[PDB]
Structure formats: structure tokens, C-alpha cells
Subunit: 395 residues, 5 copies
């Protein structure tokens, strides 16, 4: 009577109570813990080592059947807070743990009448996910979390949800914005696990769908690459100025290399595969340097005064292409004759060499048409990728 209600209740409950045993009056009936998880934020995502870092708010509740008392004797007190180190605590944790999680400690738990026990805690989960960068700008990731007791079997601990699944699937009330990645949904699913028959352990599967935000990467990658893509408009109806034109084209190639290496060194870290953007980048440059090689080989072969190939080989190339397509006065007089030939040999040879440059000219415009076809294919596959992303958001 003189003692306060809280101290009397704590003395009546915590006394002569052994921790470390399952609080069930009959050993056959298993205890059922129920859990609930709320998304807070995605701290960091990296694809060099397949590591996902997230932050969850976790709450669990179960029945501690030893902790019962009559509220009518204890001055109407239907609430109690006790240290978490003095009662039973189940070992429910995630199946994979690349680290400890460096979780803070909350050393208080709730105790209602009729044995209800609740526990709240924040958790920082660092795990491993099967990340893929098949579609880099428009990426969706399906990660998994597995809540399971590491030692107890299905005859001891079973897992259940606090709320209906439909409410869990839509949870954005706590997720903070201004982040690189955003939550789409969380899906719970009850599975049964077993590796070796004798024992069957319970399981709780949480599927998380995460979608990237293609704004900063899109702006920093697609816009400036397309803008510096100027060989398309330069190579249209190319003149025979290749000699100095490809000198500047090789300068431009050096600039492109710089642009390719800074981007490669900073953004991609996929160690198992390649995005489609990278391989199409690669093949576009492949046939650009090939166009360079053809347009330098032509001018180098016609450069000299040997008129390219005077042997019957150009006609063969043409026909195969078509098939696959389907005294003193005497001295002064002799003086006159020697002058003319020298005065007109130079410009004649120069103009004959220059006139062979239509043979020079051919076939580069054709592979330019092939380049335009490749550009159109790249644009249409980007459009289809955006369409795939739009379907990906259909949830």
C-alpha cells in the first residue's frame, strides 16, 4: 500500500524469474513472434562488391506467458517498461550479413497484461544483392531480405505479420526524398526452408523493388555525348580534303578518348557484365575508326604519282561490288623545242592525279549510310529502353 504501484509490480514480476528459457507453460505449443519493417532510406549502392546498405525501423511482438498479473490488484496499471536484458529475447535476424550492421541499442521493452511483449529498434542493414547493370540509365533492382531464427526450428518459433500485407506493400510515409534511388514496393512472402529434412526452419521473405532516378546521369552522359557527336554532320558528303581533315579527326579522336576515359574511370564499376550503352558506344567507335582507316588508306594509296593501282584490279573490285549488290638559227630553233614540255609537264601531272580522286571518292559515303543506320538503331533501342522502363514502373 505505502509502496508505489510500479515498484511493487516490478518486484512481483521480475523476482524469481529465470531468463534463457522459452516462456511457454506447455513445451509443445510454439511461441509466435510477429514483425514489421518500415523503409527509411537507401544509404549507398555500389556494384563493385554487390553491397546494399539500407535503414529500417523494426518492431516485433509476441506473448511472454509467464508475465501475467491482475490489474485490479495493482492499482489499475495496464502498461509496463522493463529492461530488455532481464527477459527472453528471440534471435530473429537476417540470413546474410556482410557486416554486423552497427545497430544502436534500445534497452527498454513494453509489457502489457496477458503476456503481450513489444520491442522497437532501428536497424542498419548492409547485405548482398544480385545487382545487374544490363540497363544502366533505366535500372530496376529486386533485392531480398530474409528474417529467420538462426537456431530455433518451426516447432519453436513461427513468423507472422503484424498488419495485412496490402498495407505493407504501400509504405512511403517515412521514406525521405532527395535521394539517388527511390522505393517502389516491399512484398512479404512466407516460405519454408530446409536443407536437410530432419529440421525445418521458418522464414520471412521481404522483396524490395528499387528504381533509379535518371536525371543527373542522363544529363551528364547522353546530352554531351550526343552533342560532341559531330562526325555525323561532318562526314556528310565528305570532300577530298581528307589529308588535313583526318588530321583534325584524329585530334577529335583524342578528345573523344579523354571523354571516354574520365567517364569510364568514374561511373561504371560492373565487374561481371556490360550495359547495352557501353557495347553500342564501343561498336559505334569501332566503325568510326574503321571509316578513318578507310579514308586514310584511300588517300595514301592515291597520294603518290603511281595513279593508285594501274593493274587490272580496280575493275575487278568494281565488278565484284556490282555482283554483291545485285647552225646558229638551228641552235635557236632547237632551243625553242626544249622549253615547252618542261613548262607544261607539272600542271598536267598534277591535274591527272587530282582527276583520279573520284575513284578515290567512292564507298565512304556507303559506309556513312551504314553509320546512319547504326545511329537510327541506337535511337530506336533507346526509345524501346524508355518504354521498358515505363512498363517497369507499372508495379
Amino acid at each position: 500500500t505505502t509502496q508505489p504501484a510500479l515498484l511493487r509490480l516490478s518486484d512481483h514480476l521480475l523476482a524469481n524469474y529465470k531468463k534463457g528459457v522459452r516462456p511457454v507453460r506447455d513445451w509443445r505449443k510454439p511461441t509466435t513472434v510477429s514483425i514489421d519493417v518500415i523503409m527509411y532510406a537507401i544509404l549507398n549502392v555500389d556494384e563493385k562488391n554487390q553491397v546494399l546498405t539500407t535503414y529500417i525501423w523494426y518492431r516485433q511482438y509476441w506473448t511472454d506467458e509467464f508475465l501475467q498479473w491482475t490489474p485490479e490488484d495493482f492499482d489499475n496499471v495496464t502498461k509496463l517498461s522493463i529492461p530488455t536484458d532481464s527477459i527472453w529475447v528471440p534471435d530473429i535476424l537476417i540470413n546474410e550479413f556482410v557486416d554486423v550492421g552497427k545497430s544502436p541499442n534500445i534497452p527498454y521493452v513494453y509489457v502489457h497484461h496477458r503476456g503481450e511483449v513489444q520491442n522497437y529498434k532501428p536497424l542498419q542493414l548492409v547485405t548482398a544483392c544480385s545487382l545487374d547493370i544490363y540497363n544502366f540509365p533505366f535500372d530496376v533492382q529486386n533485392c531480398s531480405l530474409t528474417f529467420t531464427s538462426w537456431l530455433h526450428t518451426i516447432q519453436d518459433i513461427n513468423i507472422t505479420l503484424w498488419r495485412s500485407p496490402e498495407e505493407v506493400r504501400s509504405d512511403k510515409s517515412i521514406f525521405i526524398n532527395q535521394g539517388e534511388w527511390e522505393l517502389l514496393e516491399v512484398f512479404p512472402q512466407f516460405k519454408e526452408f530446409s536443407i536437410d529434412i530432419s529440421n525445418s526452419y521458418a522464414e520471412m521473405k521481404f522483396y524490395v523493388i528499387i528504381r533509379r532516378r535518371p536525371l543527373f546521369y542522363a544529363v551528364s552522359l547522353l546530352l554531351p555525348s550526343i552533342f560532341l557527336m559531330v562526325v555525323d554532320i561532318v562526314g556528310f558528303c565528305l570532300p577530298p580534303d581528307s589529308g588535313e581533315r583526318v588530321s583534325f579527326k584524329i585530334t577529335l579522336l583524342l578528345g573523344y578518348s579523354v571523354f571516354l576515359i574520365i567517364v569510364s574511370d568514374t561511373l561504371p564499376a560492373t565487374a561481371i557484365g556490360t550495359p547495352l550503352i557501353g557495347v553500342y558506344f564501343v561498336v559505334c567507335m569501332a566503325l568510326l575508326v574503321i571509316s578513318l582507316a578507310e579514308t586514310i588508306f584511300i588517300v595514301r594509296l592515291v597520294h603518290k604519282q603511281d595513279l593508285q593501282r594501274p593493274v587490272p584490279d580496280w575493275l575487278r573490285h568494281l565488278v565484284l561490288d556490282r555482283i554483291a549488290w545485285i647552225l646558229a638559227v638551228r641552235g635557236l630553233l632547237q632551243e625553242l623545242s626544249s622549253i615547252r614540255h618542261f613548262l607544261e609537264k607539272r600542271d598536267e601531272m598534277r591535274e591527272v592525279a587530282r582527276d583520279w580522286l573520284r575513284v578515290g571518292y567512292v564507298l565512304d559515303r556507303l559506309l556513312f549510310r551504314i553509320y546512319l543506320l547504326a545511329v537510327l538503331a541506337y535511337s530506336i533501342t533507346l526509345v524501346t529502353l524508355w518504354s521498358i522502363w515505363h512498363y517497369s514502373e507499372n508495379l
Copy 2:
């Protein structure tokens, strides 16, 4: 009597006292903890992962109503220090915790008569903030801290301030100088939190305003970029020396690229957006390389002796631009005739080609005027940014 006062008081108080329960004689009345926070320093700010690291000095006080004694019996002692592990300690912490905070431990607390209990501690807070780099040189950040009990509700623990808010808003007595970022104000605000009706948890909001120092970044970015901006004075009344001038302009472009890549690789780490300085940088270079492309296309098209376009297309371009603007002796005689034409063909063709370079010249000065307009817009938007920063300091 023979025993000293301190040991007698400690024996009288710490004995038969159960920790882990709320020290209230009636369970209905909630206990009220009050807090106080002082800024020390901003350790590190990075925008790659939205992480803020700060250092605070924290003090809290409340009423431990079990710890009461009469000073007239205990030889006039109105002060007491006891270990912090032997009494009740509330679980007031910040809502977000990207890490533990790696806080040191101070295992002593104050105990006055009439149940007053005070606690001092230093805290190293590492949190997540909605950082934005919309205005890079002149940046202001509004971060938030949320002191809240992780388990107890509003019927158990309520939060209050030790001092008046106006004193808290101006606190620079401890903040150390010589740092990259500086404190502006700290604002407390009492909110009520609830996610699900049944329970309502208290809350304590601390809004921190942090302003950057634009000295080293300004000196290292705006001054040398403006100084190496010399194409403005080079491109004024450009002569027809473009052939070798744009060879050196492409060299200058390579140098600019180097300057752009070292800066890009080191300073910016925004993964969600772009500052205005970056995009204006981008568009200025965009139309600089466009000026390069036009001034090389012109000289390459007039380079050869085909007099550019002898077809009626230049007149069309001009009119569309205007609309949008709104025996022996006989042999010696025949010898004379052949000489002259050859002796005067070369210089004539050269001078006719050179004379077509006014048509060559046009329209680059016009896009140079467009460049000057862009430069003026950049300067005026920098001025307006500085004005926005001056308003931002108005607090």
C-alpha cells in the same frame, strides 16, 4: 556520526533502489526531461552520399522523484555525484542514425535534493540531410535534428527546453573558426509525431542553418576560368587567318579540356542534379565549339579553287537571312604567245580565290555578338546570385 557524510548519503540512497522503472510515485503523471544543445564544429560535409558530421555538447535534466533526502540531517550537503549505470536513464536519441556516432562515455551524473538530476555528455552526430547544390559558390543548407524517445510515448516522456528559445537561436560562444562552413542559427520547434493513431510520440526539432565560405573555391574557380577565357578578345574582328588560328584554338580547347576534367574529377560530387555554373559552363563551351565548327567549315568550303558554291544557293541564303532579319619568224612569234598566259595564270587564280573571302568572312561576327550576349547574361546571373546570397544572410 563517525562515518563521513558522503558515504552515509550514498548508502542511504543507492540501497534497496530498483533501476529500470520510471521514478514516479503515481504512474499517471509523466516525467519531463529537458535538453540543451550547443554547436561545436562541422567536421565534414560531403554530397556523394548525403552525410553530415557535426559535434554537439548535450545536457539534460529531469526529476528523479525517488532520490530525495533532508539536507538538515546529512550535514548540509546539497550536491551529489553518482555513477550513471545505477539509476534510470531515458532513451532520448536522434531519429536518423547513419552510424552509431562513436560517442565517449561520461559515467557520472549530478543529483541535487528534491530529485533534480542533470547529465552532461558530448555527442558526435553523423546524419543524413537533403543537401542541394543548386547554387554552388553561394550555398546555404537547412539541416534537421530530431530528439525523440525511441520507445516511450507522450504519456510517459515529454521534451522541454532548459532555456528560452531566443537565447538558443544565438549561440556562437563555443563554435571554433577557421572552418569551411559556419553556423548561422539553430531553431527549436515542438512537434507531435504519429504514424498510426493509437500512439503519439513526442518530438524535438532542431533546424540548423549552415552557410559556406566562398573564398578558396571562388579564387580557384572564377578567377582562373575568367582569366583563361581569352577567346572573347581573340575572336573580336577575326581575320581570315583561321587556317592556323583554329589549329591553335583546338590546342586551346585541349587545354580547356584538361582544366575542365581536373576540376570535374576533384570538386563536384553531386549525384542528383547540376549547379547553374556547370550548365552555363556547358552551354558556353557548346557554342564555342560551334563557332569553331562554323569557322572551319567556311574555310574548308572556300579552300579549294571551286569558288565555294557557284550554284545559285548563296543568294538564296542571303535573301533568307534578310527575310529572317526583318616559218622561223612565225615560229618565234608563236613562241611569244604561249609564254604570257602561263606567266599570269597562277597569281590571277590565287587573287580571285582570296577575294572570295568576304563571303567567307560573314556571320561569324554575328554569332560572336551572340557570345557576348551570353557572357553578359552569365555576369548578370552571377550578380543576381550574389544578391540572393546577401538576402540569404538576412537571417
Copy 3:
């Protein structure tokens, strides 16, 4: 009777039981712990410091001979869970530990009748392995783990397997896919260790075979290097255009250098040796720059009008190569004579210099044949490497 079975059994067992001693009723008989390890994933592999990070699921079982009771008295309960801090736990650990392993804690253990005690735990092993990068694209690694008691001898603790070794050798039921490295087999072997006679300590050897996946590295290294390998097709029947050809070849060398340095700076981290790919890369470039040096030396030596070496040295080089192979009218008349020689000296000297370029031409095609032989050797050694890898998978 009134008390539940679990509490009565825990009180009967845990009471008056001293931990920290070996639970054997006769001290002569040693206790035998048995272990079992399952692969989960390979977290990270790096060759800069010879560090291997893995994840294992570990279970051990032994006989705690003090913990015995009759199930017929205790209401048929053949299962028990007790805290792991209240009984004896052997100190079985790995011999090498570059770090602690940052393992989570599972504070519950199983206790059956007749003294059976089982323990489950996850372990994150970070160790040191004798990694070799002799064969980089097609690599196989043989790491070792050594389970051993750090203090107890063979007269106290002996190690045994739970299951037959043949089942342990094939374990892929838990290993997660989508990783850089994949498991091949785990092999257990019982060894006896001793450094100094007096004492003999037991040991448990686990040999792990890990095979790399050559997809992303192969695509990013062999395909683009082979594609940019174009000097092979350029250098075939090289013309005497070397003057500007090697100017572009040196440009290409600069590009190759860039390609070599980004790759070197990012992928290889071997600090003790070299892969065969690197050294063959090195020697191929060696003789490419040597071809460059020869083809510039030739054109520089024949460049001037000194006709290369008019001294009898070229014949010596040829023979050593073959051996190792096994008044007024008079004034006008005098005017005529002076003109001709000047009008025909220039082109004559030019054509004589040009005609000496067959001597110029020789021997570069021969070292080109040597280059082709080196390329063939590189291809055939790559084929043999793939064949070695195919044998390596034979397990």
C-alpha cells in the same frame, strides 16, 4: 508438478554447475568436437595485400557429459535451449586471422539428452592466401582454412567431421550466383601439427578451389586490344610514305599509351610477379617501337641528298646478310648554254634520290614477318591457356 517442465529442467540442470572446466567424468578420455562448414559467398578478393574474404555457415556438436537427465521424469521433453555463456564452449578457430572477422553473436545452444550439445553460427572469414596471377584471364586459386584449438592438445580436443567427406566435396545448395568468383570444391583433410615434440595439436584442413569468370575482363581486354591492333594490317607491304605515316604511327602510339595506362592503373595489382599477357604485351610493343625506330632511321638517313651511304658499307651489310641467311651573236649563243643545266638539275636530283628508296625499302618487311610470327605465337599460347583452363575445370 505445479511448476512447468521447462523451468524445472533448467533449475535442475543449470544449478550448481561450474563452467570453465572440461565436462568429462574421467579426465583421461578426451572430448571430441565435430564441425561442418557451408560456403555462402566470396565477398572480395584483392591481390595487393593477399587478402581473402569469405562467408561460412558453421555448426559444431559434442558431448557435454554433465548435462544428462531422464526424460521419463521430466514430462517427455527431449529438447532444450540454453544460453551459450552458461556452459563450456571450446576455442576452435582458424590459424590465421588478419582481422577479427566481425562475427555476430548467437547466444543460444541446443541440449539433447545423453549430453549432446550443438551450436550454430555464421562466420565472416578474412584470411591470407598464396594468390598467384601467373594466368590472369583463366585463373584458379587453391586457398586453405585450418580449424584448430589454440590452446588444447590432442589429449583434450580432437576434430572430426559430422558427415561423410564425399557429401562435403559437393556443396552448392547455398552459394549465391551473380558473383565474380565461383566455388569448385571444398576438401577436408585430417593433419597432425607439431612444432616442438612435447605437444601435438590437432588440425582440420579445408582446401577451397575457386575459379574466376572470364567474361567481363575478357570482353573489356582482349576484344578492344585486338581491335585497336591495326598496325598489323597497316604495316603489310608498307609504302615509302613513312614520313607522314610514322607521324600518325606515333599519334597511334600515344593512343596506345593511354589505353595501356588506364588499364594498368585500374586492373592489375600484383606486387610480386607478372602475368604472361602483360609480358607478351610488353614484348609486342617492344618490337613495334623497334619497327618504328628502324623505319624512321632509314628515311632520315636517305632524307638528305647525300644518297645515304656512298661509302662501301651497304655492300658489306648485304653480303653479311646473305652469309647469315645461308660578240653579240656569241653572247646570245653563250646565253643559251647556261639555261639548260639549270632547267634540268632539280628534277634529275629529285628522281635520283627517289630511286634510292629500294635500298631504303628493304628489311622492314622481314621484321614484319617476325611480327606475324610473334602474333601467331601469342594466339597459340592463348589457345593453350584456354586448354589449360579446360583441364583445370576437370576437378
Copy 4:
């Protein structure tokens, strides 16, 4: 008697003794702890985040007035070692703590008669200092440490020195050599701290003076920069070979850029200011590129055959500079006349253009004299910096 002296003394002292209270028989008299710190090494200094890492050996002593006994009864034992967890330990620590310090634990303390208690410990201090890089090669830093009790006031704990300050100021007996930074002095000073009147807390200020070693940085920076500074000797009496000279000067500029960027990327990390060496580096390059711009503008303006500016503007520039300084036979005859002018127009125009290059030449030598003046100023300010450093060592 039969029991040994040590066990009897430990039983007599440690028994019935309450820890967690101040060991003073009268509560009014404060206890006085005294400290002593010895420098060991400076582990790491970085200016990106203002972090100082040091290593100290710390010893403290005070009077535990409860721990007294008569040595004449306890078999002459004037020395005792007891665990540090069983008695009172003051909470004296440093005011700033960017981390915990990761200090090892020494769980033994000394206990003499008459209550003397001593404690030895090593500490690894990581703190924040107001680092400045105003004078980079010749730098001196003044860091501060503040030993203070985090909770107790001046009426409870006071701080004193073990030894005289003069001995503390000279302490190099433990400092290890072969380090980047070296100790100069440690200065103790007793301050009184208070933020809010009611309470006054004690304080112990340790000022540390640290001086850098300018050997490796000096060798790697000043010697090679001065050596590659060759434009000074090249630009002396510059000839009119600017056309190809500034082509190589721009090549040299590229090399200088490389030298500037590797150094910038590796050594400086000041985020708040600039050293004088950097700004003088910047201004020297500023007017070097300005000399480049002037010497290219001149040759480009005189390049063409328009004789630079034939308009009366060069005279204006000169005067402003001075002010600021303070049938058949007829056909053959007509044939002769046409030849001469063509045969002598070319070389005449060439020589007239070449002769205008004295006007070309002027004023670059004058700005070269300005460059020499800047070089002399740089040398003299380096000399004055060395003199400042020599005064800085005066201690």
C-alpha cells in the same frame, strides 16, 4: 599471521568500500588531481578536414583519502597494485574529440600509504586544430589540448602539474625521429572556464608548437620548377622566329600544365585559403600566357601582306607610349617589258614585309623586363620567408 601480507592488506582495504563517491572525509575540501604528458610522435597531419593525430604518455596522481593503513602492522609493505575498476577514477579528458582515440586499457593502479594513488596510461589523441597553409614550405603550427573534467566543477576537482613547467617545456627524450614533423615545445597554462556564471570549471591548456621539415617537399618542388623555368633564358633578346617558337612554347605550356596538375592533384589540400607560392605561381603563368598572347597577336597582325596597320594608329600608339613613359620587232620589244616586273615583284614584296618586323619586334622585351622584375620579387620574398622561418625557430 599465516596468511601472506598482500592478501591480508587487500582484504583489509578493498572490503566494505563503496566506489562511485568522492574519497574525501569532509565534503567541502576538493580533491586535486595532477597530470603529466610526454610527446611520443605525430602520427598524421592532414588539412582537408583539420585533423591532428598524436600519441602521448599520460600519468596522473591524487589522494584517495580512504585508502590509508599503518605499514608497521602489515609487515613493512609500502607498495600496492590494485585493479582500476574497484576504486574511484576521475573523468579528466580533452575538450574536443573528433573520435574516441582508440586507447588501450591498463587495468592496474598504484596505491602507496597516506592515500597516494598514481595511474599511467598511453593515449592516442585525434583532435581538431586551426591549421593554416599561409606559408607552405616553411610552416609552423600552434595546436592546443585542453585537459578538463567533463562534469565536476572547481569546487570538486582542480588540476595541477606534477613537475615544474620549465622541465615540461623541454621534453625530447621520448620523441622518435625520422618523421615529417618535429616537436618544438609544449607549454602549460592554467585557465578558468565558464560559459554561464553559476558554475566554473577548471582547465588545463597545453600549447604544442610543431615545425615541418622542408627537405623532400623543397627538393621535389622548388628545384625542378626552377629548372624547367627556361622561358626566362629563351625569351631573352627574342628573335622574329615566333611562328614556330611559340608553337614549341605552347608545347612547353602543355608540359607545364601536366607538371602543375599532378602536383596540384597530390600535394595541396587546403580548402580555405592559398599559400603565397601558389598565387605567385599563378601570376607568373598569368603574365607568361600574356606574353604568349602578345607575341602571337603581333605576328598574326603582320603576317599578311597588308603591312599590319597602314592607318594612322601606330603613330598614335607610339606617341601615347612616349607620353606615358615621361610589228615583229615591236612585238619582241613589248615582250621584254612584261618580263621584268614579274621577275622582281615577289622578292620585293617579301623583303618589304620582312622589313616591317621592327615595328613587329617592339614592346615584348619591355614586358620581359617586367617578367625579370617579377622573378626578382619572387626570389626576394622566398628569402624573406626563409628569414621568417629562422625567426620562427627562435622559440
Copy 5:
């Protein structure tokens, strides 16, 4: 009798035994702990912060004189294992500790009769060593470890070796191969330490000799640098083709710069000094760029038609070098005279300019001989370095 021997012995020994005091029956006699250390591996060595990371196996033994019993009463049991937290443990540790060492815990210790107590533990030591990179490829390091009690004096704890020193000096039975660094010897030495007279603390010095493996660094540094060293064979009997030769030499310089910067950025991290290889690298490049400067200055000074220096200065340079060495028909006739001079002025001036290039040629071959002398000095100092390394292995 009914109770087992182990439990009876543990109850008889661990009961009524106070830990935290020195187990000596007379306080005057000091206790003597003996230690033994075995090398396992060298985890990481870096010279940016003078940090050494090693792994040791440590065992200590001493006499716990309270723990004695008669084996004839306790059923012949001469072996015992007890937890390490229940008895006295000396605080023997290393003097320097840049970190904690993150050592695992082995909570069991051996106890024989007659008070013998042994303890085994693995230790991961991270320390500070006076590393020097004076001789980079052929380096030997002499590190020190100091086992000492941090609180107890020579009157309480003395250090001794378990085995003879000669056996300790040769210990390679546990060291793992395939590492960057290898063990040479470990040398123990007994020192006496004192800083301040009153007290004298014991000490145990372990000198470790570590020798690098010069295979990967040698292959990656000396072979390719020597191979790309081709200016030696190019500069031999240099022709007057310098104009384009030094254009390619400056290209080669750019390539050398790239080679120098990647290597500098990756391998060296010495912050206090320089290796001899670096400074000889520096001086070789110094006089290579000086050769470049001389050979460009010569050709630029003779480039124009001013015949270099027609002033009497070349003779002065030569002599100082030698000293330091120790009507109509009239019109047609006038027409003839004007032709000849123009027809023969050009080639005459060209050949006179070309003929002045022997004066052009001199002195570069002489500084080439100086280069060859420098190369020979570099080779001979490398040979002497290898000889020093061979003596260094003499142990």
C-alpha cells in the same frame, strides 16, 4: 570420491582466491614472466605514415605461487585449464601502439602443479618504424619491438626468454611464403629503461630484419625504362636533321613524362627523402632537356640568312674553348644581263647557309660524351648497389 576429480580440483583451487594481487607469498621477491614470439607474416608496409603491420604468435609463462596442490590426493591429474579472467594476468605489452591491434581473445590458460602457468595468444601488431627508402630496389629494414610492463617496475616484474637466443634468431618454420617482404632474423636483447631515476622499468627488445624482394619492381621499372632509353642510340653522330628530329624528340619527351608521372603517382610514397634512383633519373633528364635546348638554340640561331653571328664572337668562343680544354640590240643585250643574277642567287644563298652548319654541328657530340659518362656512372652505381645488397644478405 563420488565427485569427479576435475570439479573437485577446480572447487579447491578457484574458491576463496582473490584476483588482482601479485601471487607471491613474500612481497620482496619479484615474479618473473618469460615470453616467446614467432613470426607469421608481414601484412602491409607503407611509407606514407611510417606504419608496419605484422602477425606474431605469442606465449608466456610464469609462476602463480598460490595455485599449488598435491597430485597424489587428486587422482593423478597433472594438467588443468582455467578461464583467464579468474586469475592474475600481467600487463606486458609493446611500447608503441598506433592502434589497438584488434587481437582475438583466448579465454583459457594452462595450470600445472608447482604453480606453473602458461598462456598462448595470437597478436596482430601495427607499429611505427624508422623506414628509409635511401636504396629503393635493394632495401633492408631494421624494425624494433619492445615488450615491457606499462606499470610494474623491475622490483615486481622481470622479463626472460623461454628458449636460448640462438634458436630464436633462426625461426622460419611458420613464416608463409609468396609475400612481398621476407624475414631475415629476429634478435632479442635485454635492456634497462629509465627516464627519471626513482624508478627503473624492465624491457625486452626484439630487432627484426626484413628484406624486400626485387623481382616485380625491378621488372616493371628497370627493364622498360632502359628499353625506352633510346636517345642514347639516336643521339650518336647526330645529323643536321634537328628541325624535325627534335620535334619528334619533344614528342618522345611527352611520352617520357607520361611514363614518369604514372610511376610517380603509383609507386613512391616517401615523404622525407629521395632514393638515389630518383635523383639520377632527375639529373639524366635534366641534361637531356639541356641537350634539347642546345640543339634547338643552335638551329634557331643559324636558321635565318644572317649567317648566325657574323660579329667576332665565334672566334672568341673557339679560343676560350681551346684555352679551357688545355637601241634595240642594246635593249636585248641589257635584257640578257638581268637574267643571270636572278637565276643563280637562290641556290647560292641556300648552299652558303647550309655550309655554315659545321659551326652549327660542334659541341653537341661533346655533351653526348658527357651523357655516356653519366650512363656509365649510373650503371656502375647500380652494380655497387647490388653488391651492397649482397653484403646486406650476409646476416
